Amino acid sequence: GFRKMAFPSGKVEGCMVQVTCGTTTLNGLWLDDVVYCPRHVICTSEDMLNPNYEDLLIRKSNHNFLVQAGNVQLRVIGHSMQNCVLKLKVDTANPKTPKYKFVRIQPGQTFSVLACYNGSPSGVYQCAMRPNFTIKGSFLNGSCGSVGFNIDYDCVSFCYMHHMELPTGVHAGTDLEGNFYGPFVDRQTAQAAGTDTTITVNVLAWLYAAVINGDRWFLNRFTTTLNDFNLVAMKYNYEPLTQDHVDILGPLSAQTGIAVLDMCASLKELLQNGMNGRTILGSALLEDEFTPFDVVRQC
Amino acid sequence: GFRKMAFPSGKVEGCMVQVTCGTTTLNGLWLDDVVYCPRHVICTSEDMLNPNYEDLLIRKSNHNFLVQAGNVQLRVIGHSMQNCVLKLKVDTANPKTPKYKFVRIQPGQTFSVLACYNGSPSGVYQCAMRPNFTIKGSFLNGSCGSVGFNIDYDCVSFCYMHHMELPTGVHAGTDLEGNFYGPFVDRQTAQAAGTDTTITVNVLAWLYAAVINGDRWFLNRFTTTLNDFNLVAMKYNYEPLTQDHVDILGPLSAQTGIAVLDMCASLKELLQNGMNGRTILGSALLEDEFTPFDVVRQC
């Protein structure tokens, strides 16, 4: 079988707290004795249009921040700002702190999102960093400070903190150093992203997944060069395929005995013709939010 | 705009253990001082075609069961069989036991699965119980004893425990009282699922979701009786609606002001005429794995 699969979220659930300043409430991440959260918690409705965050922060005291782990209030003993992330030092360490790292992911890479409201986890799902640095998430009011992450041998790699929604319904945020992915800004304005593209290496991974699970109507006897595939890919606003990408697909190629460039020839035919009403793994659309690693692990 | 979202898995992660007999290891669920697992952990390969579980259990003693949380052994102090589940009394009450219930779900209901191997969680995903009492999971060897669950106001409702795969690649299992969903048995014999059908109540939920988001071209000014709709539905391999289905659509019907039987009339028209090249929620296919509760959550 094959489904979109998220990492188990327990290690991150143990770190989620509620952070309140004024009449603004969102989520924070409690690691050791520090709570990380979006800096726009310090804004008011009038501030959010063109906020001078340095000015706004100097006017705040430690006692203006209300941090709550469940029913328990945590005392803020210091605060600083790192790009778009506020760091609140608290006097108690989180015993539930996992082994962790802060990473900045590359477009095309996937991660799990733990969506939280008022410091309480609500759901978990798998996202990809779009090539235009948006993410197609499910985030409502109060979700800010929800984080995205991957897990590797009990170590949690935090890669995303949520900040905003765009008019098209996609989302934008930062890494845990507070730098936005993409050309976005934490001000209350309608922002557009650059033109998105489809993550080609992931579509190929997913086609290999469809084959591993016995779905093959789209395979063909033809083949293609890497450059000629990339010309057609770019015409249809697919990302070009690098030789690193070809190499990353090897294990799936071997597992199925289908050369990478043969699968490229199949994808080319789908782009040029369509799916003729047929479906792949249930979908009427080509899916590009499974990486090669994702497919392997689950297969 | 909608995606499969799982419940945060942490409360369930804290209950997963491994249960071994000889070299056969699967997963178990540790709640208070009882571990629940599939009874076929007591089978050798020779026993699995036509096991005499009652006879196999008589030869078992407490000291034959290796239960481990991680690498830490949990001593077994009693054992009993309840239908297709083994219950192992252990000498330690699980300190991470959540508030919980055992529930038996209906076809069409959705739940999160925490896929586990050797007592270690690998991933979490959302499943729907199909009308033929199979699920389309992602399960590998050693996944038995993985559980499906819903979470309501901090209470975990356990509804599924995994036991087997069917030739078509779908999966079958029991509730936590050990009664299989569907006509299946825990024997290593070839078994067939009934022909599957589309989950009508979930398609209706999906149409309500489309209306909530402003996509409502398919609404018409007609209605139908429940019986007339059910008789048409069956001719298109749609599940007939129950009174419980009508009731769980209540909130969405209230939210939109569209009576359930009016929406049924719109669906009937879609079934009899097709989509005429149009889309709903950006899809030419009707989705049937989002329940009325799922829709409310994400909307």
Q: What is the CATH number of the domain that holds A219?
A: 1.10.1840.10
Residue of A99, A107, A90 lying closest to A37 (CA atoms): A90
Q: Is B55 left (phi over 0), alpha (psi -120 to 50) or beta?
A: alpha
A vs B, Cβ pairs < 8 A, gives: 91
The pair of three-digit structure tokens given for residue A22, joined into one six-digit string: 């004024």
Give B81's strand partners: B86
Q: Quote the minimal CA–CA distance from A273 to chain B in Å.
A: 17
Question: What is the spatial distance between Cα A203 and Cα A206, in angstroms, rounded to a whole number?
Answer: 5
- Find out whether B281 and B206 touch, Cβ atoms under 8 Å: yes
CA B246/CA B253 separation, integer angstroms: 10
Write the CB contacts of B56 (distance below 8 Å, at least 6 apart in sequence): B42, B43, B47
The C-alpha torsion from A120 through A123 and A124 to A129, rounded to 10°, is -90
Token reading at A133: 């640095």
Task: Report the b/e string of B155-192 with b at 16+ CB within 10 A.
Answer: ebbbbbbbbbbbeeebbbbbbbebebbbebebbeeeee
Contact A7 B138 (CB under 8 A): no
User: Could you give the C-alpha distances from A23 to A20, A40, A44, A196, in angstroms and in order?
Assistant: 7, 12, 8, 36
Using an 8 Å Cβ cutoff, are B289 and B110 in contact? yes
Active-site residue, B144 included:
yes
Cβ neighbours around A286 below 10 Å, total: 19
* Nearest-neighbour CA in chain B from A172: distance (Å): 15
Q: Return all residues near A152 (Cβ < 8 A) that are at least 6 apart.
A: none
Give the sign of the dihedral formed by CA B245, CA B250, CA B256, CA B257: positive
Residue tagged active-site, from B144, B159, B171, B264: B144
Nearest alpha carbon to residue B72 among B16, B13, B116, B22: B16
Q: Is B3 exposed, middle or buried (0-12, 13-18, 19+ CB in 10 A)?
A: middle
b/e B203-231 (16+ beta carbons within 10 angstroms → b): bbbbbbbbbeeebeebbeeeebebeebbe
Chain B: give the shortest CA distance to residue A62, in Å. Answer: 31
Cβ-nearest to A138 among B9, B138, B298: B298
Q: Which residue has the tokens 């289905």?
A: B245
Q: Which of A2, A6, A9 sits opposite B10 (nearest CB)?
A: A9
Distance CA A54, CA A126 (A): 34
CA-to-CA dists, residue B224 to A61, A163, B232, angstroms: 63, 46, 11
The CA-CA-CA angle for residues B1, A10, B150, to 5°, reads 60
Sign of CA dihedral A218, A223, A227, A228: negative
User: What one-letter code names the amino acid at B231?
Assistant: L
Instruction: State both tokens at B285.
Output: 């296919």
Instruction: Please report the sign of the dihedral spanned by the C-alpha atoms of residue A11, residue A14, residue A20, residue A24.
Output: positive
Place of tokens 């005499």: B52
**Residue A32 half-sphere exposure, CB side, CA atoms within 13 Å?**
6
Of B133, B123, B140, residue with least CA distance to B173: B133
Which residues touch A262 (CB under 8 Å, ≥6 apart)? A219, A222, A223
Of A118, A122, A87, A121, the C-alpha closest to A102 is: A87
Residue A210 makes CB contacts below 8 A (sequence gap 6+) with A2, A216, A218, A280, A281
Closest Cα of chain A to B25: distance in Å?
Answer: 20
* Beta-ladder partners of A71: none
113-152 in chain B: CB under 8 A from chain A: 114-115, 121-127, 136-139
Closest CA to B118 of B14, B16, B18: B18
Set of chain A residues whose Cβ sits within 8 Å of the Cβ of B123:
5-8, 297-298
Distance CA A221, CA A212 (A): 18
Find the helix packing angle between B260-273 and B226-235, rounded to 10°. Answer: 30
Q: What is the 3-state secondary structure (H, E, C) of chain A?
A: CCCCCECCCHHHHCCEEEEEECCEEEEEEEECCEEEEEHHHHCCCCHHHCCCHHHHHHCCCHHHEEEEECCEEECEEEEEEECCEEEEEECCCCCCCCEEEECCCCCCCEEEEEEEECCEEEEEEEEECCCCCCECCCCCCCCCCCEEEEEECCEEEEEEEEEEECCCCCEEEECCCCCECCCCCCCCCCCCCCCCCECHHHHHHHHHHHHHCCCCCCCCCCCCCHHHHHHHHHHCCECCCCHHHHHHCHHHHHHHCCCHHHHHHHHHHHHHHCCCCCCECCECCCCCCCCHHHHHHHC
Rg over alpha carbons for chain B, rounded to the nearest Å, is 22
Q: How far is it between the farthest Cα atoms of chain B? A: 69
CA-wise closest residue to B24 among B41, B2, B49, B38: B41
Nearest Cα residue in chain B from A4: B125
B8 touches chain A (CB under 8 A): yes
Kindly report the backbone phi and psi dihedral angles of residue B297, in degrees, each rounded to the nearest multiple of 5, phi listed first: -50, -55
Asked if the Cβ–Cβ distance from B14 to A10 is below 8 Å, we say yes
Query: What angle do the packed helices A260-273 and A200-212 form, to 10 degrees?
Result: 100
Closest chain A residue to B127, measured at CA:
A3
Mutate which of B12, B71, B120, B124 to disrupt the A interface (most A C-beta within 10 Å)? B124
Closest CA to B117 of B138, B132, B134, B135: B138
Q: State how far residue A147 is from chain B, nearest Cα, in angstroms.
A: 13
CA B52, CA B48: separation in Å to the nearest integer? 9
Distance of CA B153 to the CA centre of its chain: 19
Question: What's the token pair of residue B128?
Answer: 């729907």
CA-CA distance, A194 to B238, in Å (whole number)? 42
Q: How many CB atoms lie within 10 A of CB A246?
A: 17
CA-to-CA separations, B26 to B11, B43, B96, B241, B282, in angstroms, rounded: 20, 12, 20, 37, 41
Mutate to test the interface with B, among A2, A7, A9, A15 (most CBs of B within 10 A): A9
- For residues A208 and A253, the answer to whether their CB atoms sit within 8 Å is yes
Provide the residue type at A256 as one letter: T
Tell me which chain A residue has its CA closest to the CA of residue B283.
A284
What's the alpha-carbon Rg for chain A, to the nearest Å?
22
- Encode burial over A18-48: b for 16+ CB neighbours within 10 A, e otherwise: bbbbeebbbbbbbbebbbbbbbbbbbeeebe
Would an 8 Å CB–CB cutoff place B219 in contact with chain A? no
B43 is catalytic: no
Name every chain A residue with its beta carbon within 8 A of the beta carbon of B115. 5
Beta B34-38 vs B85-90: how paired, if at all?
Answer: antiparallel
Spatial separation of the C-alpha atoms in residues A89 and A106, rounded to whole Å? 30
Mapped to the 3 state alphabet, what secondary structure does chain B carry?
CCCCCECCCHHHHCCEEEEEECCEEEEEEEECCEEEEEHHHHCCCCCCCCCCHHHHHHCCCHHHCEEEECCEEECEEEEEEECCEEEEEECCCCCCCCEEEECCCCCCCEEEEEEEECCEEEEEEEEECCCCCCECCCCCCCCCCCEEEEEECCEEEEEEEEEEECCCCCEEEECCCCCECCCCCCCCCCCCCCCCCECHHHHHHHHHHHHHCCCCCCCCCCCCCHHHHHHHHHHCCECCCCHHHHHHCHHHHHHHCCCHHHHHHHHHHHHHHCCCCCCCCCCCCCCCCCCHHHHHHHC
Domain that holds residue A24: 10-90
Are B96 and B9 in contact by the 8 Å Cβ rule? The answer is: no
Closest CA to B146 of B14, B28, B225, B36: B28
Cβ contacts (< 8 Å) between A214 and chain B: which residues? 169
Residue B70, token pair as written in the block: 């991680």
Closest C-alpha to B249, from B212, B197, B198, B195 = B212
Give yes or no for a contact between B35 and B80, defined as CB atoms under 8 angstroms apart. no
Q: Contact, A270 vs A284, CB < 8 A?
A: no
User: Which amino acid appears at position A172 of this protein?
Assistant: A
Asked if A98 is an interface residue toward chain B (Cβ–Cβ < 8 A), one would say no
Breaks (C-N over 2.5 A) in chain B follow: none
* B49, B60 Cβ separation under 8 angstroms: no
Contact B147, B12 (CB under 8 A): yes
Gap between the Cα atoms of B231 and A239, Å rounded: 48
Cβ distance A63 to A22 under 8 Å? no
